[model samples]
Target: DIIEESAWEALEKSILYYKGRPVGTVAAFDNYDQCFVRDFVSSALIFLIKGKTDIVRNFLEETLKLQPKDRQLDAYKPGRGLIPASFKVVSDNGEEYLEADFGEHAIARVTPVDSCLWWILLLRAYVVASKDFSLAYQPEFQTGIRLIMEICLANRFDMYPTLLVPDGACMIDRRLGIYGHPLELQVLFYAALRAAREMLICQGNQDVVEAIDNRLPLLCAHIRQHYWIDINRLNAIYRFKSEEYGKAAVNLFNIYVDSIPYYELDKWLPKKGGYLAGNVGPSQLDTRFFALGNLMAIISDLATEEQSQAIMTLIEDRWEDLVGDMPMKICYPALENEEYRIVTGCDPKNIPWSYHNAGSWPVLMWMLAAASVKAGKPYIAGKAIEIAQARLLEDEWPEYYDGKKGRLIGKQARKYQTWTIAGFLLAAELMKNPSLLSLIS
Candidate 1:
């Protein structure tokens, strides 16, 4: 009952929108309605998994009607477009391409590196909930996948160094570079393709899997050659690093791998195996990177049982390191001194934020629950549940939380963020069980 209550409560608040459209919360820079489409679908997934047939049916029907048909997957000028985000699109008779945006809030348009990730998440939610292959194969979802794939293929070798487009599209905030190019993006591509292939398979098609298999290995090789950093002193463990974040020195890169290369775990894990190297070079203990990577590891099945347990241990030990008095710090407290400022990625005014510094994010909490569930720790899952159910849902999921006070920050922060709702639904799905619900009760 507690589990259902927490989940339904969050779902109800998330669904409350403006003029029958999901508000982009003032935090959104563009299209306000599509934001809720993303969140509602996600929450609907929790209901679907839990066999809440009525709730699931109503949510899906509403989503189908609002689902934009002509939404362009790549980049386009913000007019009556489907997807949110700023980018310029030129249509020359029959041709279309995007001119990238680099600044934090570029007026023109920008290619988002994680667009594929968004699609994959959406497709997965749709497939699991609807169980309707025809709906899954709709032109909108297909176009999204194809457009993103084309971008990935086009930029496979276009690695350049800059503030924004580090390896691929740099993160939204141009603070410190977290993931580089191939790791996260490639993993996302692989996942998207894989999800599509699953849909095809369900419809009695097998040809799609071949393309996915072909591309998957190429991505893996790229990870090995470019993304990986072999530190002999660290037991010859192969680690990955974003080109922006230097080279692999931590387990952060593992998040990019679609599945935990368990066969290769012997090489990375030590006798006292636990947390792998996170970031390249110095800022290794970056808590946001750690949480993000940890979530990735859990979802992708990159970490072994021992490795996952070690990560949860790290989370508990470093809980205070990440969890602060006012809010959860994205990094550790050891970097409080100016001498260690570089390690902290802090600016004078921005402090530990701006560049994956120490900003509290609602989305990360979703991934945290997924990772905790993968590791088989219901109690840890319960903690993540508490964070989502208690902290975020109680206050309204906003743009970001205060890095110190654990409170919402920013004037323009959206009260109901799509990503935040998506995260809550993800946690609910992972935490679903009679026993887990009993524990919450």
Candidate 2:
């Protein structure tokens, strides 16, 4: 009851009220003052489960309206159905316009690979909840969905058959640490392709379904083959192909992969696979553990049963460091080496143990709970929900907390973050009825 009360209050407060009518789209927080596609879609499951049909319909309608009609990037084109990262309701002299803001990060003007995937996934979720099949057939919606599929296929690297996104192309933004190909994007890529395939089949579009069917299996195979790293008895997926060497390479600290002209692949690759390596370009391998990537690996079916068990064992091994006072840390032992400054930049906010660099995000709790449930570790899911509820009450739903020292909340984190609140609601609901976890996935 306490969880539901706090979660409902948080969700109610997060709704954006413009001139008294519900904007239908919720804002990330009071400060953000815009409806972020990623946040809304991530949080949408709670609304769907709560039977808040008006909110769900309004949010979906507003998002569809914002889909770009013209190709804005080399990979995107008109009818490619890409959604913006966020949009604001602006009033100019008595006239109001929903201004779409794409490329919500400092580095890129294009939407991240996950945004399109999230949109499609959420659309499927909407239909599931409301049984509104007509929405998928809308001319604009169908055009956009078709285009999104095309863009994803167009951008995939030929060698990998997986999505090729630039650094700063995901939720991490310009944390150059995730430039090349990160596990998070690939996991979402798999989910999105599957969701699109299902939606297209429902609409009786055989052409797109055929293409997705052919592509899905190859991407799944590639993810399992390349992403899995088994070195030094530490078996898990690498976060991304590192362009920098590991700490073992004493003389090559912070050096780009190209600088090592005579390097041998056999000699340089880590024998102990705890760290994630950027192996695509002139680079070094990173050995940090990211919770989101690992959890997603399970949800996406990228990890086998044994592999999933190993991942849980690894988490249990580092329980204090990874879970600690918070539900989970974004990554373990935040990057402090001066060399990483070249990869993650010098932003004081992201400076080690803060923000994306080992910061603890409650928003990731739902995925943790979902993965835990799937692994038959329901207690872990309950623990995540308990931590989230307590934190929501303690900090009034701050965006992130300090993972290094459990009690320290993020210095710049926003209060009443929509995704954080939604995460709590979803986790609480799942804890009550574990069967619902499949709805969102």
Candidate 3:
């Protein structure tokens, strides 16, 4: 109760309003003042659940206004529907103006794939909870929705349904050479595709609706068929013949057994351990457990009901390793040894158990709880919350946790992180009212 009250205080303090409208909350009260798109979406959903739809509406509108209308020259700027990764309502001169960051300031252009996706997701969540069909069906919002879907669906050299992104694009925002199709971005892509489809069908955008419909099943099938890795899948890979030619090909991604360290993997997994791969590409299968992508896999229906349960079972089975010290790992099996050097370039901030290299992010707790509750596995969330209940409030709600078991606060972590506080509150709230999971799904 005290922690919830404290979390409430921290969350309320971070709220940044623009001209009396609840525009958005900063990433952390102490760390920064900018309202990041990903962070705000996490906070916005909770605000929606708390019966505070006005704040959600303001965030959605302000963000939509900032969506890329810049029709620049050449094949650059990733035009039109590109939503900013973050924005600040600047109070300059005698008037207030908006400053948006599409990796322009303190961000990167390595594809902010999740920004636009999260926008659609938050908008969908807002529409579902408030049941305000007119807000989404409005002309500006409709154009905004089409822009997002079209830009994403625009023909590219990429020959697949998943996104072609760089490392540190999504939440991991670090250079681990995870620069292919990551599960997190793909799931968000899938979720937003579904989110946009739902929003568009109600309007008379029959063409876009058909476009999304054509791509949706393909994206889901590609990810589900390929990205999933389990004991059985791993064993299949262990015995999988690499070289093939025609439609009777045994290897789709050409994953050779040599790429899989089955010897080390044997020890890494417990009984019945499985999860969607962290990133999957030709001859590459990142066997790490990415919490957000997998959990979202459940929420977005990207992962079937059975796969959802397996993911939960993996988390539950390996609780001490995965959820120990803290409640969730953003990506597990921290890239190490030669691989760490090759991928991370030996960034001191990302040594084995630090930052995105198997670091525990309490901000992911709400997702874990949401997925767990949705999949009939509330006990995992309950146990996770029990572990977090001990440290989150005491740690002053730091951005992330470290150590092999997430026992230490991040070396460079900022305290009073809004999402960490919001995550705890959201997870607790979801556990309290399990049915609220639909508002997000």
Candidate 4:
């Protein structure tokens, strides 16, 4: 009860008003002046499940209004069904409209793969929560859904099986260590496709429904088959494909030397008793373990039963490395090499053990807690809830924390982060009744 109350207060504080509608929650107050589609969808889920139908409806309607019209911006060509990474209400000549950003920086060349997926997921959630089936059939809403599904199929789908997102195409944008077909994107893709199928069925679009149904099973089967890897018979999955050079490389360019034969570096990277590879490229596996990928794999049903259990056991086996004083780390042993620097552009925000590199995102605890419940390890969820409740109250709900020691980490990390509060609420609700996990999954 205390946790829910605290989350509610924090959530209410994060709401950003646009033209008199509670349009959405900003990612954070201190630094972010915009609402991110990904963050809003996640935060909105808590409200959706709680039957705060008006908040959900207003947020969805406002977000849909910001979708691009018949024009292209950066990688978002017209009709791509893409949503902005973040958007803010800007006034010009006493009129207001959303000024969208595809990439956070002033330069806007990057487009996110997950924003549209998140949009579709939230659309379904809104319909389910409000019991407003007709909303799915609304011309604008249906058009938005069709566009996103088309974009996903065109860009992310690999044609045979599996989704193939480029390395910098997700919330983890430009973190190129996971460029090709990351497990997180694949799982999101799986959930998005399934959600799209259900929505289409509700709209009586039998042909599209059949199309999605045909590919959904193949995507699931492909993920379970190729993603899972075995080391000493300890089965685990890879985060995605990444690039690495042989440990023997004298320097970054030595791999290209004609006289020396280059060895695949992933073969020699030290693994901690068969932990999931953070990313696996053709000749290399970024063997660092990632908590989000593993947790999502389970919750999305992309991991097989045995693989899920192995993932849970791996978490148990490496609690100190993966889950520290904080509930979870994005990835263990943050990359500290030229390879990573090259891929990530050594952005100060992504310094080793900070930000997306290995930061402890309190928001991710939702997935961790939910996956634990699905794996029949309620104690894991309980422990996460304890940490989240204590820290959320103590820190006044900051954005993220250091994975190693649980100190607040982001440069302009804000108190009352929308997703942090929402994640805590979601985890608490699920812990109270594990059966409700299906709603989010």
Candidate 5:
């Protein structure tokens, strides 16, 4: 709890207070792909850290108003959909941004790999942080949830329709490939579905829960049948295919799916130091995915206690390989070639773009801290907290950190970044209760 308390207080100090209102409702980063997940998740964590109940209540209320209208849902573009994946507050003026379907329908645009999935995650965090259900019943929130669930449920079992095509198949910096079918996406969708069910049931909507439940088991069965890889002769068994993009087994994406199992733990241990590079035909050694994938494995509950310990050991063993003395780089520095730098799993030039690569993404740290706590090592989580605290500058957090000097980089990078702070709070929470989960409703 020491890490959580200290990190919370430090984050509070970093909060941007404008005209007595918090200006950090959105990340100062220039990535304009607006979605509600960024804003709501950030605000919820900030309120939790400061223990500002009123602020928490206000954020949820505000989130409802910004939700997409019925027509907007239909017109949602791949990345810039109107349905608030989460709220996005313009860091410059504290104005919120959402994409509209020509002022009316949902259209397909540059859909980021994880954009659509963020909606339920944001709502779950908001519900837990605020413990508020009144907002959930609001027409906007209720409609938003239903529509999102409809869209996701419809798309879950299939992967071809969402792949690289002119009909909005590319994700992040315009790459051509299917983003779903990744182990991470499947597991996350399952969790989000469960969260939505809980939210609806909590509101006394058994009909919604029952409907979701009916479809859920089928999805679960599909996941188990398609994703799980049985490895006999290991203490921990089973693995997940990385992404549906190419072949079924991508090491990085597999790590995400591997962490969150329908049951049991992985036989591989991180501490012993091993990397399950993806076997997908073309994609080789996804280092960036490695960092996040490792963290995801632990956080998603894929690894056994022994595996968790092994992962920490692996991280320690390979710290210099992935990240030098500075904050962790998104991937291993060895794979800095042009091809590996710009593909689907390697977008943002895969160099140091905010999202992936061997760059210093603040949000990734959030996952890392959460993983550390889950692994019963708050000290590691605390170190990540300390890095996040040290990274904030001018009340703003940058999109990425310089791998060489550990300094903030990117245009206006040092502006109040919401995710950075939010990550800090989440890390704090995990530090307090190492087993606390971001997915808990």
Candidate 6:
């Protein structure tokens, strides 16, 4: 009860207001007056949990205005229909204006793919939870959905179903070698596609509708068949021969057997467990276990029921690696020493078992809880909530935890983190009443 009360207090402290209206929460930076589109997606439901849909609607509407129109970049590929990584409602002498970060000020300066994806996802959640279908049905929102699809579904020579992206385009937000068809991007792309498929009206925009129709099933199939990793799949890869062309090709992605370190890595996979890999590219299988992607895969029903159970099994079996002192590592198998230097551009941060290199984030609990409940493995999140409950507040709600086992408070992590408090509360609700997941699920 103490932690719960404090979480509420912390949540209140983080709200950024605009002209006496509750807008959204603050990001980790020292500013309490800005709203991050990426961070709001996780905390937006906390508003709905209180029957306060107005704040969410304000956020959605205000952010839609902030969504960038077509910009002059590569004339061949004009960047359009994207959301900002964050925005603030501060201004001079009581006047209000928005300052949005389209990654122009970010360390790496890559526009976030998550902002747009999460906006569509949250937009659907808003409509579903509030029973206000009219908002999504509005022409402005209709065009908004189409524009996002246009960016995501752009016809490139890339024949793969998974959406391709460069490194540092997501929450990881750094050069951690997360480029290509990362599990996180594909999973969100899948969930957003599902949400957009429902929220998009099929009438006036047949092209957008047709693109969604064409991509959803193929995306699902590619994720299930290719990203999955298990002992059986390992053998199939070990014996695979590369460079076969056409329909009857024995090998795909030109995945040569030597390309994988799985030569002896097979010993690590559990006897009866599996999961979707971190990233899948030509002759590449990022074997690291990524938390956001795997959990969202379950919540979005992108993973089949059997696959869901297997994913849970892997978590249960490898709790030390994935769910250690903290509820969960953002990803498992930290890239260390030589590899970390090579992948992260020899950066000053993201050291192995620290930050994005397998760091533990309490903010992940809501998704973990939702997925666990759906997978008939509520105890996974139940235990995680118990772990977080004991320490999150006492630790002053740091942004993330370091150390391989999450035993250390993050070296330089920000305290009073917003999503940490919000996600903890949301997870507790799901565990207490699993039915609440229907809003986002």
Task: Compute the lDDT of residue 94 as modeled in candidate 1.
Answer: 62
What C-alpha lDDT do the candidate models reach, one value each? 0.44, 0.67, 0.84, 0.69, 0.48, 0.83
- In terms of lDDT, model 3 sits at 0.84
lDDT leaderboard ranking = 3, 6, 4, 2, 5, 1
Q: Model 6, 237-261: lDDT tens per residue?
A: 6655443455335455655566566
293-324 in candidate 5: lDDT tens per residue? 45655665444455556667766655544444
Model 2 weakest lDDT span, ten residues long: 232-241
In Å, residue 154's CA in model 2 sits off its true spot by: 0.8
Candidate 4 residue-wise lDDT, 1-441, digit = tens = 676777787788788776777778888765345888888866787777777677667766776776765545444343356787778878654877777776645343567778888888788878877767778777888777766766666533345354555566776775647776676677777888887777664455555566677778887776665455545322211221123445433131121223211132234222433334455333444555677777877877778777777787767766766666667787766776895678687777777777778877888888888899998997887887776676677777777887465665456567778888887788877788887666657
**Clash pairs of candidate 6?**
none
Of 1 and 4, which scores higher on lDDT?
A: 4
Number of colliding residue pairs in each model: 21, 26, 1, 5, 30, 0
Steric clash pairs (candidate 3): 168-173
Weakest 10 consecutive residues of candidate 5 by summed lDDT: 161-170
lDDT of 2 at 228: 50
Cα displacement (Å) at residue 233, model 6: 0.8
TM-score of each prediction = 0.60, 0.83, 0.95, 0.83, 0.63, 0.95
For candidate 5, what is the TM-score? 0.63
Which residue segments of model 5 deviate by more than 4 Å? 1-24, 29-36, 69-82, 85-108, 111-116, 130-132, 137-140, 156-180, 202-211, 214-297, 300-313, 331-335, 341-355, 386-397, 404-412, 433-441
Model 1: residue 136 alpha-carbon error in angstroms: 2.4
Residue-level lDDT of model 3, residues 32-118, one tens digit each, is: 448998998778888989989898899889989988775645443555778887788778759877778776534355447788888
